[PDB]
Amino acid sequence: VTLKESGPTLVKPTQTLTLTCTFSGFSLTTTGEGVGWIRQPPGKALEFLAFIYWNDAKRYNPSLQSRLTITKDASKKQVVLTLTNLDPVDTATYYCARTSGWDIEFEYWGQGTLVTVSSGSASAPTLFPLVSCENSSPSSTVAVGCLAQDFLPDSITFSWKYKNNSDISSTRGFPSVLRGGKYAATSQVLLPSKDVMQGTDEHVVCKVQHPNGNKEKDVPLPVVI
Amino acid sequence: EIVLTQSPGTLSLSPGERATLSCRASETVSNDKVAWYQQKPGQAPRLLIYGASSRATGIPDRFSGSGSGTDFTLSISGLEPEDFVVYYCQQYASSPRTFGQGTKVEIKRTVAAPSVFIFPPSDEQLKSGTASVVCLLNNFYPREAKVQWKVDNALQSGNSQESVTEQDSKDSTYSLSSTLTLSKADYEKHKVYACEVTHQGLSSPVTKSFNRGEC
Amino acid sequence: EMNPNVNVFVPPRDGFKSKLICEATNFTPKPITVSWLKDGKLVESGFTTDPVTIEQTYKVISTLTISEIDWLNLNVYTCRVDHRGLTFLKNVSSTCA
Amino acid sequence: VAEMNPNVNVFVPPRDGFSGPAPRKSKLICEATNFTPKPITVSWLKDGKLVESGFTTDPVTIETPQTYKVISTLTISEIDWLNLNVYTCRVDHRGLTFLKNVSSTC
Numbered sequence: 001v002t003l004k005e006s007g008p009t010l011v012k013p014t015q016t017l018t019l020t021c022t023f024s025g026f027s028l029t030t031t032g033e034g035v036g037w038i039r040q041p042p043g044k045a046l047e048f049l050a051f052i053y054w055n056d057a058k059r060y061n062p063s064l065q066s067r068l069t070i071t072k073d074a075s076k077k078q079v080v081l082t083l084t085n086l087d088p089v090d091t092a093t094y095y096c097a098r099t100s101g102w103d104i105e106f107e108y109w110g111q112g113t114l115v116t117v118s119s120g121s122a123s124a125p126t127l128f129p130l131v132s133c134e135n136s137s138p139s140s141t142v143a144v145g146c147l148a149q150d151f152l153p154d155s156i157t158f159s160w161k162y163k164n165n166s167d168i169s170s171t172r173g174f175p176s177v178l179r180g181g182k183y184a185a186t187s188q189v190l191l192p193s194k195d196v197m198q199g200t201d202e203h204v205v206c207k208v209q210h211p212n213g214n215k216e217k218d219v220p221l222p223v224v225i
Numbered sequence: 226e227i228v229l230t231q232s233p234g235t236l237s238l239s240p241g242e243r244a245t246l247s248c249r250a251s252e253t254v255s256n257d258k259v260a261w262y263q264q265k266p267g268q269a270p271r272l273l274i275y276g277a278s279s280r281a282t283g284i285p286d287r288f289s290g291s292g293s294g295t296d297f298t299l300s301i302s303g304l305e306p307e308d309f310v311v312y313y314c315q316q317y318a319s320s321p322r323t324f325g326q327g328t329k330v331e332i333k334r335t336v337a338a339p340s341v342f343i344f345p346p347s348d349e350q351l352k353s354g355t356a357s358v359v360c361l362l363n364n365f366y367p368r369e370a371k372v373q374w375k376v377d378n379a380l381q382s383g384n385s386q387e388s389v390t391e392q393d394s395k396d397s398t399y400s401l402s403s404t405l406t407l408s409k410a411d412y413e414k415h416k417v418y419a420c421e422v423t424h425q426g427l428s429s430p431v432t433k434s435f436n437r438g439e440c
Numbered sequence: 441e442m443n444p445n446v447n448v449f450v451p452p453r454d455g456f457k458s459k460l461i462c463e464a465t466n467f468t469p470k471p472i473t474v475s476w477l478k479d480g481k482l483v484e485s486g487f488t489t490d491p492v493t494i495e496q497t498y499k500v501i502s503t504l505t506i507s508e509i510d511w512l513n514l515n516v517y518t519c520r521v522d523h524r525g526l527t528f529l530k531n532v533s534s535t536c537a
Numbered sequence: 538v539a540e541m542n543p544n545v546n547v548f549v550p551p552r553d554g555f556s557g558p559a560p561r562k563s564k565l566i567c568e569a570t571n572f573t574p575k576p577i578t579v580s581w582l583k584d585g586k587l588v589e590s591g592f593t594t595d596p597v598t599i600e601t602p603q604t605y606k607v608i609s610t611l612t613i614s615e616i617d618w619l620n621l622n623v624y625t626c627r628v629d630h631r632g633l634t635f636l637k638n639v640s641s642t643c
């Protein structure tokens with residue numbers, strides 16, 4: 001038993017949102033079996049949208065009543081979900097699950113899909129250099145970062161390389177935050193102080209792999225020594 | 226409308242010990258139809274126990290449920306590193322059903338002094354009319370920390386979102402980033418920008434600042 | 441970025457083997473390389489470099505071992521300082537000889 | 538564990554060792570090595586007059602009997618050097634005083 005979701009990755013506010021839950025391996029003929037939708041905004045808990053039983057029996061949430069519609073098609077074996085009056089605060093990932101009886105609720109879960117509701121467009125990310133202004137305190141090591149801004153949807157992977165195309169293990173990845181209708185993220189890397197006062201390499205390159213452009217700006221080291 | 230509240234929000238446990246999760250309901254649930262779910266960030270939630278007393282297929286026997294009415298407790302014997310995820314309690318006797326806030330369990334560790342670094346906005350970024358000042362906190366414990374922005378002795382408010390990373394897999398520490406956003410015209414009207422960091426393991430607050438034009 | 445000053449000390453005219461000290465002061469950044477030359481020939485042994493200390497400015501001192509007979513023969517000793525891609529050479533000799 | 542008399546050495550600038558805006562200035566180096574115990578007193582004398590300013594003494598550092606070294610630097614003026622002034626380095630070690638006299642005369 002497995003479930004698969006599908007739908008648009010970007011929808012404008014105050015529009016119509018449609019999602020499809022693809023399942024195969026069972027039929028909604030026996031009693032107790034049902035399909036439900038659960039969403040979870042980032043940093044929040046699960047939210048119950050609606051649940052539909054057999055014999056075309058559907059249940060809706062009073063907090064969201066008269067705003068959602070549940071339709072099923074046994075021919076294609078997939079439930080259709082329609083969402084109207086889209087709001088930026090309602091952005092979340094939607095999941096569907098199968099209930100195998102009256103007591104075993106949501107036994108199998110799919111994978112879900114991120115549906116971003118932003119008035120903006122999917123523009124290429126913008127990188128900005130970061131210069132460390134630390135002074136009078138070299139401390140253990142020095143840090144240099146890379147500010148990826150104006151990206152949508154939030155799907156970015158960070159990799160750090162030296163001037164000679166080496167490999168660096170940073171693993172410092174900060175989650176994105178919705179600020180002014182756009183997602184912003186920050187990434188840094190830790191480098192030893194000895195290497196700064198050594199090789200002639202005075203800068204490193206910041207690389208981001210986003211499906212809107214393959215730009216890669218370089219962040220120059222401030223050098224303190 | 227059954228309101229479910231879970232407390233405490235965050236608890237620090239150690240591997241091998243016993244962890245007890247509390248689930249509070251706003252009213253009695255018919256037939257004690259309360260179930261527990263396990264969710265890991267990135268992946269999808271998985272069912273563990275249905276009906277608060279019967280486990281499901283592919284679930285270890287170390288998870289046990291107890292209680293009835295409006296009080297439910299989840300006991301887990303033999304805590305494992307992979308079990309440090311968020312857990313939710315949900316009842317299916319409401320129709321429509323409701324979900325709780327959820328509780329997160331973290332690995333208990335010693336207090337480590339954080340590292341504070343501030344990067345002034347680049348000249349290229351200033352050309353776009355937006356200035357971004359960052360305040361980075363790394364290698365601190367516990368997750369609870371206060372980050373306040375003070376510029377020209379004036380405390381700022383209502384302009385900091387605050388982003389915090391998850392627990393490190395190999396270091397068990399936490400990291401967070403604070404971003405300062407202000408207009409380009411307002412940026413030129415201020416000289417010194419500083420973010421104050423307060424930590425439990427620090428005797429006195431440490432403040433870092435920079436001078437405009439020297440960086 | 442400030443060019444390092446090169447100064448070479450010589451043994452007293454009225455007598456002292458001896459040592460040659462080349463000092464670079466008021467230079468930035470901290471890393472700096474100091475070597476010695478003898479009549480235009482590279483020196484492979486007999487010289488040591490002390491750890492760089494903080495006087496922000498830094499200070500570096502080096503010691504070269506020389507013999508009295510070589511000094512009296514009007515041998516030329518040159519201190520080579522490399523800093524930010526620039527090379528500075530200072531030549532000294534006995535005043536009374 | 539042992540007592541050894543310190544060795545006093547004085548370094549003087551060459552004839553072309555003066556630079557900078559007029560009046561030019563230079564430095565004098567007095568170093569005591571292979572002395573024990575670690576405590577030692579270094580003083581600078583100029584024509585019999587004690588020098589109370591313009592000098593910096595480096596901390597004693599370690600160079601089998603234990604050995605130590607001390608480096609002292611005194612700033613001097615070109616005009617004073619041209620007047621055949623004699624500079625004497627005063628070293629005190631376990632109550633013993635050692636004096637070294639240097640001059641520009643050949």
Ligand SMILES: *[C@@H]1O[C@H](CO)[C@@H](O[C@@H]2O[C@H](CO)[C@@H](O)[C@H](O)[C@H]2NC(C)=O)[C@H](O)[C@H]1NC(C)=O
Nearest residue numbers: 162163164165166167194195196198199200201
């Ligand atoms: C690229 O240049 C860097 C210099 O910053 C090299 O790093 C040095 O080489 C060793 C061996 O790879 C590294 O482990 C050290 O970080 C550096 N050495 C010292 C003494 O600190 C790096 O190796 C170069 N890349 C490649 C592929 O050779």
